[PDB]
Amino acid sequence: ATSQPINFQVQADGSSEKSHMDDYMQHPGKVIKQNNKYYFQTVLNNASFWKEYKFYNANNQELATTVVNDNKKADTRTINVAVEPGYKSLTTKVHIVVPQINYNHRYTTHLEFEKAIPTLA
């Protein structure tokens, strides 16, 4: 495997403004190439709140996610999202539940990479 950091901002549906979702992911993320496949690797903070997350490209194709690491003590989760070189955006659909505070919501957002996913040597 090889990798590079990549900056990103999650933005609110229909807007270029920062989404609250951006505040619950670590930055920067990473691009990884392994076995000729590309992934965006990112860390979800307060992972227990993220009851469902789905990623899509701009064409609305599904992007497979896998769990790389679950840090239960820190409540973080590292995931890989399948991507291709040239991707600039991802659409996300998330179900966020924090029961203590009566928070159970479904959102759409768009994750904007600083620069398009690169080809890696």
Ligand code: HEM
């Ligand atoms: C994993 C944790 C959380 C995630 C991923 C998340 C994500 C989001 C998203 C995607 C929206 C829709 C508008 C946008 O994209 O910004 C939103 C709205 C909102 N959520 Fe959350 N949220 C989280 C935790 C919280 C917490 C802890 C609170 C505490 C009350 C909260 C209260 C709110 C409020 C007040 C809004 C609308 C306010 C505004 O538009 O600025 N959420 N959130």
